[PDB]
Design a protein around this ligand. Structure first.
Ligand SMILES: O=C(N[C@H]1CC[C@H](Oc2ccc(C(=O)O)cc2)CC1)N[C@]12C[C@H]3C[C@H](C[C@H](C3)C1)C2
Ligand SMILES: O=C(N[C@H]1CC[C@H](Oc2ccc(C(=O)O)cc2)CC1)N[C@]12C[C@H]3C[C@H](C[C@H](C3)C1)C2
Ligand SMILES: [Mg+2]
Ligand SMILES: [Mg+2]
Lengths: 546, 546
């Protein structure tokens, strides 16, 4: 019967609640118990705080009004306000003190995921303080997880006036006995209850959630750790840059701060970074997640040379130029890993910082051609299979669903063997027509890749593998050099192709290299261990790219 | 006969040249005359500086090599290097000391504009210093004005080796006697001369330009002050955000730094900011130049209400949300001016700073309906003409070329009279079929607007005018408030509709308002006085939005 969930902000989604700072200030400054709240509520519906909450005045017009109220309250109580008493000062501290209440948000997340219509209903103000950005951030981080945000100052009404609940029920397209409403102030529940809404006084979070769990019949507390926030492709800002006449580059863009350019692998998508894209934006970064040349909404010229490393790097630099970026942090995985390394080597001035997932920096062997090298490793066999234009395209484009369902697997979940692919005559010869969904990806996620590769298919992506000679000659020009910009390498325990030991010799070329390791991690790092990936990168960026 | 122009960087496009810092350091530190240059050149083609310039090593590998050379040079010269001697320190100072040489660049600009193939040919290095971004910036600002940039370290060759000139002539698709090459070091000219290229030793800039003027037969020196850099639409990064299911917003994006959101007027385009977009990017800003709802590549639903101020503002906030921006600076002109003001009023938390060109902040008259107000001013007549869905669309869409050629005029150049448009029965009744091109815009610029308005025409844009009642009711909710965030107002002397006196009362609502005035400026401010506009905004942003 419950179909909707409403959360107060202050005291429910954010802690500590600003009303409690009022008590601790009183206590701190040894003021009469409740003085600050008497002054705050002064005049009830005709008072300054209602005008604020109704949106009639801004937070800065309100500040001196509240000071007066404190004077009037302190006079009436026959005490003297302390020297250098400052309402601005106090509210600054208070507002910046509050953070998202993780357990509660995730509870709301869960409820939405099981299909509830969730909303924030809050009395709040038009904040014009020089420090308003802080609160602006919080509300941003919070609003993306809810169907609605109803702000007292935006709708001209306040809790606990009955009108706002009607507005709430209207906005929800629900009837009162279908909503649960959580709030920390009892007065505000009264009117929700009168309409027949389930209510919860939120004192301590956990108890509030136990009640919520009980009423909804969904497990909220003690539940498993949820995935990082993902991306709905159509809620994203999509960018397009022509880097030369044939060729356009597409990216997805989120956040502000230092520019971070995410470079996916074979055969993937900007979408392979769906778990990183929110995290880093939230961490303070401008994330530019590429469709690498040949993929998705990016161009895919058919010629092989269009995909050698030199051209691909030139084109990334041009990307920076047209977009006005003097530098960006480069982070790549798989093929994208290889490319960001060479970016560091040929264009240090344009690379703020470099990092790679799984892809070690391997230098060219001036003495042994890459064809020889690739033969020297059985696990590289599939690469020779990729050389003959047409063969791999045909196998891979034959059933897309099948292809990605088969590639995108966690460690325990392997259904292919990159071992003697050539001999076998294909990648899929002894793997299933209809592989099971891997635990890492949903049917919907797989279909996204499916719809993308329908645009250009595999020629472009496969071409990346077809310039072994050209890339080797090129790479050799950099044998003299060293990587001295900040650099992170991140290894995946259970990558059975990009094994962590391939990275062992990296400090020889990259003396200040920083490292990350991820246990129980296959080749598809971002979607296998998104929490860990986010943790390692954000930590790295904060110390090294700022 | 001359068809191409090549410019050295160090000493030609950038001053002071780093070789001269070497002399002044020597002089500063009382070292043997030339010691620093002996050490720099040490070993000629087998030396460290060649490897650097050839790209064999990075600038940071080079640094200690150069120190050794100084030791060896100082030993041989029987002097002791000073306590705390630091090549890094010296090159840091030097590189950061150099700036673009305005007269020279503009000379190159001019030559390109009269059809020359221009290029930079320079010996230079792979810079991995922690401070490489500085130089990265300079090269960015410089490379956008030239057909080619040939870097010694990128092509593996150096001036004055003859191979690089061959490469140069190849890249240019020119024969030697069609190029002029400017350089400050004589040795480098020698090989250009051997092939039969016109050359210029660049000592003082002005003399170099006099020779250049003489050889090319184009006036370079003493020439009129050129326009700010414009934008080629197809060299820009284009962004797309769906703000709700019907409706997508398109923007053009350039630069990094604080987010600046540019809001054009009626009936215009992101392209109306073409002169501001580079300037601000160069000034340190992330410029997001909108197609406002109803225009260009943005959506244009036909319903009027889709265009009231409230919806338009909601949708801008959503724009921020989906793009991950907690705030941005809002700058608008005309209708966009009106909108940024209301943004400040209803969403201060999301507005870092607000500024308007021509559009004063006028509050609603709670007592007099907007229809009455608009009748009270003869110069507003055209607005009543705009009310009847269909009438204005038909006149305006009938000849697009004609429409914009007629609207987009400088002050002296007026061909319409917004006076008694209704009575006359149209905007164009006694104006020409084929107006002359106004001095502000080229045929190509006008055609750009033409091709844009072909997409949705005038319904959307005109609809902005059709919510006088709705916007008035809405605006009234803010009668209690004040604008206390940083705010600039910029008036145009010769705006015969948005006259500067309409702004006189603004300090009553906006007490810290900052002001800008532009003399000899019509209504189409950005394209009328781009230099002034850029000057006022950049100055304002630097003090107020940072
Ligand atoms: O080949 C590269 N990635 C493969 C892409 C497909 C994937 O297939 C898998 C992966 C996992 C599984 C599973 O879990 O069963 C199955 C199939 C295997 C890895 N990356 C490079 C990166 C650089 C440059 C060049 C040479 C070398 C170094 C490898 C390409
Ligand atoms: O009408 C608005 N702009 C017009 C657009 C077209 C232009 O036509 C011109 C302009 C110049 C010339 C010339 O040089 O001959 C000819 C025609 C006249 C100005 N802007 C607003 C901005 C706010 C909100 C609302 C009401 C009021 C306050 C005016 C719209
Ligand atoms: Mg509360
Ligand atoms: Mg020079």
């Amino acid at each position: 019967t419950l179909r909707a969930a409403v959360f107060d902000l202050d005291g429910v989604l954010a802690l500590p609640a600003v009303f409690g700072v009022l008590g601790r200030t009183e206590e701190a400054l040894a003021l009469p118990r409740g003085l600050l709240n008497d002054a705050f509520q002064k005049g009830g519906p005709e008072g300054a705080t209602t005008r604020l909450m109704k949106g009639e005045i801004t937070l800065s017009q309100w500040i001196p009004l509240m000071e007066e109220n404190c004077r009037k309250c302190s006079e009436t109580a026959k005490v003297c306000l302390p020297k250098n008493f400052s309402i601005k000062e106090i509210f600054d501290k208070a507002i910046s003190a509050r953070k998202i209440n993780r357990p509660m948000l995730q509870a709301a997340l869960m409820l939405r995921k099981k299909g509830f219509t969730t909303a924030i209903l809050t009395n709040t103000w038009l904040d014009d303080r020089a420090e308003r950005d802080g609160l602006a951030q919080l509300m941003c981080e919070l609003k993306m997880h809810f169907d609605f945000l109803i702000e007292s100052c935006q709708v001209g009404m306040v809790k606990p006036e009955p009108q706002i609940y009607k507005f709430l029920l209207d906005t929800l397209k629900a009837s009162p006995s279908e909503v649960v409403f959580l709030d920390d102030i009892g007065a505000n529940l009264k009117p929700a209850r009168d309409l027949g809404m389930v209510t919860i006084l939120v004192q301590d979070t956990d108890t509030a959630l136990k009640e919520l769990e009980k009423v909804t019949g969904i497990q909220l507390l003690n539940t498993p750790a949820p995935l990082p926030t993902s991306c709905n492709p159509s809620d994203m800002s999509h960018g397009y840059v022509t880097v030369k006449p044939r060729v356009r580059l597409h990216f997805v863009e989120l956040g502000s701060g230092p520019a971070v350019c995410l470079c996916h692998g074979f055969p993937e998508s900007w979408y392979s970074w769906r778990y990183q894209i929110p995290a880093l934006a939230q961490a303070g970064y401008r994330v530019l997640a590429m469709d690498m040349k040949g993929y998705g909404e990016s161009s895919a010229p058919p010629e092989i040379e269009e995909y050698c490393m030199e051209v691909l790097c030139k084109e990334m630099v041009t990307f920076l130029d047209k977009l006005g970026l003097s530098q960006a942090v480069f982070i790549g995985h798989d093929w994208g890993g290889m490319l960001v390394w060479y970016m560091a080597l040929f264009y240090p001035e344009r690379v703020r910082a470099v990092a790679s997932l799984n892809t070690p920096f391997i230098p060219a062997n001036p003495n042994m051609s890459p064809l020889e090298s690739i033969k020297a490793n059985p696990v590289f066999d599939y690469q020779l299979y990729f050389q003959e234009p047409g063969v791999a395209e045909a196998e891979l484009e034959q059933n897309l669903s099948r292809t990605f369902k088969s590639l995108f697997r966690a460690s325990d979940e392997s259904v292919l063997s990159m071992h003697k692919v050539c001999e076998a005559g294909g990648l899929f010869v002894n793997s299933p027509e209809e592989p099971s969904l891997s635990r890492m990806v949903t049917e919907e996620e797989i279909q996204f890749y499916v719809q993308q590769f329908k645009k250009s298919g595999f020629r472009g992506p496969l071409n990346w593998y077809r310039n072994m000679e050209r890339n080797w000659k090129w790479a050799c020009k950099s044998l003299g050099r060293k990587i001295l910009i900040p650099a992170l390498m991140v290894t995946a325990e259970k990558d059975f192709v990009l094994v962590p030991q391939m990275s062992q010799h990296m400090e020889d070329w990259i003396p200040h290299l920083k490292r990350g390791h991820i246990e129980d991690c296959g080749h598809w790092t971002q979607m296998d261990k998104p929490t860990e990936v986010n943790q390692i990168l954000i930590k790295w960026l904060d110390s090294d790219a700022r």
